[PDB]
Copies of this chain bind each other. A is one copy, B any other.
Amino acid sequence: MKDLVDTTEMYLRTIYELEEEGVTPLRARIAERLEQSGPTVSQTVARMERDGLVVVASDRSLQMTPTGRTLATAVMRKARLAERLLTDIIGLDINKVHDEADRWEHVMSDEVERRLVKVLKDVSRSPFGNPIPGLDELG
């Protein structure tokens, strides 16, 4: 099992987050926050294209296809719902919540999410301040 658990999903999560912070999505920036080499990033992104999940634009910025964006959104949703579960119910020290959720986000089923929406007091945003996306699509 790779440290990122699901490589492709982590590249999409990265692109998503860069967008959230008004940062242009560049392969160069993915390598930086995921601590992966350039060729490695270049190869993965290349595969994501043939898979139809992202497009390397003329300016070389990364443009997620609608299907790429749907998957990325669901990964963010699972992560933030996990972060909420880990904080609100399990009581995991906040300093460990991000890394834990970073792994769980890749194995959480839509079904468990639905349950978390019903059990959690509120799913407006994650414990770190960001809005929990895709709630309406969840289903």
Interface of A toward B, CB cutoff 8 Å: 1-2, 5-7, 9, 85-86, 89-93, 96, 99-100, 103-104, 106-107, 109, 111-112, 115-116, 118-119
**Cα separation A112 to B100 with both chains bound (whole Å):** 8
Which B residue's beta carbon lies closest to that of A111?
A: B96
A1-B2, A93-B111, A96-B112 known, 15 other contacts, Cβ within 8 Å: A1-B6, A5-B5, A5-B107, A85-B90, A86-B112, A89-B89, A89-B119, A90-B112, A90-B116, A90-B119, A91-B119, A92-B112, A96-B109, A96-B111, A104-B104
Counting every copy of the chain, the complex holds 2
Chain B residue at minimum C-beta to C-beta distance from A116: B90
Q: Which 8 A-B pairs have the closest CB atoms?
A: A103-B107, A1-B6, A90-B115, A91-B115, A92-B115, A92-B112, A96-B111, A104-B107
**Which residue from chain B places its CB closest to the CB of A1 in the assembled complex?**
B6
- Tell me the smallest distance from the CB of A78 to a CB of chain B, in Å: 12
Assess the B109–A107 pair: CB atoms within 8 A: no
